[PDB]
Write a protein that binds this ligand. Sequence first.
Ligand SMILES: CC(C)CCC[C@@H](C)[C@H]1CC[C@H]2[C@@H]3CC=C4C[C@@H](O)CC[C@]4(C)[C@H]3CC[C@]12C
Ligand SMILES: CN(C)CCc1c[nH]c2cccc(O)c12
Lengths: 221, 230, 42, 264, 336
Amino acid sequence: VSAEDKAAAERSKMIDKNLREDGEKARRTLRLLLLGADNSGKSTIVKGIFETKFQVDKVNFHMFDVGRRKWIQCFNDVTAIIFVVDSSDYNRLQEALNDFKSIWNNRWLRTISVILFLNKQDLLAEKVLAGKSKIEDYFPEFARYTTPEDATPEPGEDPRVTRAKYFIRKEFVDISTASGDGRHICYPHFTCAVDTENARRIFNDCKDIILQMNLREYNLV
Amino acid sequence: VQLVESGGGLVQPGGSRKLSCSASGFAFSSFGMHWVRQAPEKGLEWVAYISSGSGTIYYADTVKGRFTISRDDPKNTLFLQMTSLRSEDTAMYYCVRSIYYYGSSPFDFWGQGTTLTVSSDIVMTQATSSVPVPGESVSISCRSSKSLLHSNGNTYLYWFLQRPGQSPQLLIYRMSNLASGVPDRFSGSGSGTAFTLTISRLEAEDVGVYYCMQHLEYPLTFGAGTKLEL
Amino acid sequence: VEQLKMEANIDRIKVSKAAADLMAYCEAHAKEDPLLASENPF
Amino acid sequence: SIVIIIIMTIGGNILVIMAVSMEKKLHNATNYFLMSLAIADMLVGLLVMPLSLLAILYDYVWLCPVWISLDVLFSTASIMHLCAISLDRYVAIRNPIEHSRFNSRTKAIMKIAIVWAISIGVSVPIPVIGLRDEEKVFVNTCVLNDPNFVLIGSFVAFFIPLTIMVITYCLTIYVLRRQALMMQAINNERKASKVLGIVFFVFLIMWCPFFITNILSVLCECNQKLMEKLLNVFVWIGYVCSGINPLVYTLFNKIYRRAFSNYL
Amino acid sequence: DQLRQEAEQLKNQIRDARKACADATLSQITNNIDPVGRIQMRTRRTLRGHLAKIYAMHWGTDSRLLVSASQDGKLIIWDSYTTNKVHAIPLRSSWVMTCAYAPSGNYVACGGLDNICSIYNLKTREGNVRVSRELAGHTGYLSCCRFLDDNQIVTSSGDTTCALWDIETGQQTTTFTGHTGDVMSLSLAPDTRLFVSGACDASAKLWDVREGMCRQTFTGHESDINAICFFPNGNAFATGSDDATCRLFDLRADQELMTYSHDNIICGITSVSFSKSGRLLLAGYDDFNCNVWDALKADRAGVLAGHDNRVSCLGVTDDGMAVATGSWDSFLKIWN
Ligand SMILES: CC(C)CCC[C@@H](C)[C@H]1CC[C@H]2[C@@H]3CC=C4C[C@@H](O)CC[C@]4(C)[C@H]3CC[C@]12C
Ligand SMILES: CN(C)CCc1c[nH]c2cccc(O)c12
């Protein structure tokens, strides 16, 4: 071959080397997708496309906030999805349940786990203690609900907020258990506007997900 | 885009000297570099070549074992180490920039040059000493000892123009490709071992010496040169 | 309403004529289609 | 009669080898090692089992100086494969993120190279000594008599991997027990312990008796006739656990079960 | 209250006008045309280097240079004959969804979820590829871009609008409105006078570039339209949708001509392209393969099954001697 073709081959080899070098750094960052409706408090869970970065225990995370039928297709390689729901507005809980159902059963997200945050617990507790609004006005089935004997309420909590919180958590979880066949798991959590431990929960859940994938890879499950 | 060479001076036989070139205005690390030497009554001669990534290095058959070429990407500088200089080394040295990929122009830019004073190959043949001659047509021809047409469809012939007091400038590469910045008055054609250069209309700036070069195999060879006198 | 009215004023032809034109175009350039060893660059 | 186990071993090794190429969609770093293990087991079945049956049929000799070396080499390779799988399982379980970052074909190639390099070390001197000393390989009749190899290579072949595997199993069980204290996330972490226990105990049961008998036949001399009678039947158990390892490591993922059901 | 009745009456008038011209079908006139037979194609080149799913691909005018875009954030220019790489272009954002190659070979364009169309200069004296201009003004994501010349570009976005741009000044000169859903794919006529846009409202529209007015609207699909191709003669459409159906439209009969479907296909369609003569229709599927269709018979001539994941890219060279495909397995293949 001519000398110019050899020089072009050398240039191509250098380009391949530079492409290979860049790929190593990309694989060391975990990517997360953040979804939720307005008034849910998405921007405070860890405090065209908005981005944020944080690091816990020498592990880097990258979270994306877009702004759903079309652009969701390009987020099928993320480690986990974060979903935030306001638990102190009974008028709009059915919309949240419908959105969670529409996200859980999406054909492009069949292998991605969901981390569920139930936010604004203090307002829910205040409303339940005040007694100016009742869950039974919107959820008739709540009048027949009883707190399970295996509940572990926080010490000092009145036994009237635990019932409401567990009812909401059950209503959200029951959608997750109806389908999936073990391919992905939901991780409910209770948080508030002032909690700071939220960073550790994401790290623990991601480590658990990677452990599950490794267990499946070695023909153990 | 600017290349400035330094060094030079008067040396005694058996001595040594080191030349340097400073590059600016372009991505130096992506270009290959050549050194070209021109004698007062001999024409252009190829000396050495270094790849962009310092992978491959070539030397002329008259400079092996005495000349050393090096590259410094972080400082955008070149170096040429010369030892055991002879009387035949007194000549002008030029620095040339080269890049190789599909559709590129490997001999687009030339430096200014510095002066140094002491005390199988393909033959390219031109035969005319002076062509006397504004507004007229002029044809200059070149002839090679071996065919320059490769099996891939490319033919490696280059044309250069050297005005008085100026560095060589690229006109045509691969026998039909007009270089950027050149007016459309220049054209070229040929086949096999015979090539011609055509100028449609001469001006006051078309006076100089025209050179032919082949790029099939190393070492690179140049023609004798054809002088156009208006 | 205006868009529908503007679209209504179209001079239409038979489907058979357009299909015959499509067939004629397909037949006319049949010899120039290399997809339908010394010449293959790959 | 006993020849059936050879056919089953060959069939299982062929099924394991085929279930990786044609099926595809299988990570190289963890599924290419099983192909090497299957190839080693098939070579065991092809070069070792048919020749011992000839000795059983004849009760005499005819071979020995190269058959012994091949048997030792391939058995050591299989044991090293099992130990490497155990170590890799422990590493992948305790440090998921670092293991996920590390996974590449340069680990599978390195592991295969290391196990096959170690496997051949113990079999080189077997023909070297045998061809220069008939008594070392023929006694009274094909059996390795020299203690200088029996009491030396046996530890490297069996006894160190056993300690590595038991320590790995204990650490992995402890780690899996500790993690579950933090639901499908909890249920899946017990089946792994069940499978690990099954595999470890199968390996221990199938391989333990032969080396104990072989050490006692040398360092405790004890009736040699009874010892050789026990060796004549214990060595075949080690051969049997060459078509079982390709299975117990495979037919727990639904993908492998479906591939085996459709192919066979 | 009164305008709805007028709109319904006009729609009924248009429907009655369209039905009057259905005097024949393709399935009847083509009974005298021999089938193309069985077509076999094999892989000739394999392009490696991408580390993520490939989303866009486009051929040059010389039939040798090729540009591809992927989620790794880099843009690669390929030499198809030798597999050597020519350029590697980093992107400011990794969520790229489309790419294009200028007909003169001097510029390349790209875009995605950042709502900005960026144009790159491939021929500079410094030797580096540099950004020439960023085109802003859309509110949704950018799905496709196509060059008209060195100074005009047409873009489609998810905000139901289309635009025609002036590269020299960076200002929008014409806005195309009338869609009710996100706009997915564009196709430019050979005469550079009309372009076609598909959208998620299961409709297709024909636009006039010089005036900015919609001329015709086509319906028939039951779901979102993902890809649109243009017949070489300028008088036909080729469209695909998520209902596993391909359709042929005519701009003079103003109605559908032929439907391409099969009972064994239950997946979506990602790309549609034509051959030089228009006899073959190529389509990408989510079944991890590509099918070859007979445009005049709605039959199946062959299949390409060398990919291990979804096929997202499909293109044919100007000389018709090669077909290129792209998939989410980070590999490109050249078929002949
Ligand atoms: C894997 C093949 C070659 C068999 C070799 C034995 C196995 C069990 C052992 C030997 C050394 C081990 C490696 C040692 C170091 C690391 C770095 C760590 O951050 C990820 C796991 C990784 C990459 C280990 C994986 C398993 C490993 C390869
Ligand atoms: C029976 N066979 C399956 C293998 C025996 C063997 C492997 N390695 C050894 C090392 C020393 C002494 C031995 O008998 C061995």
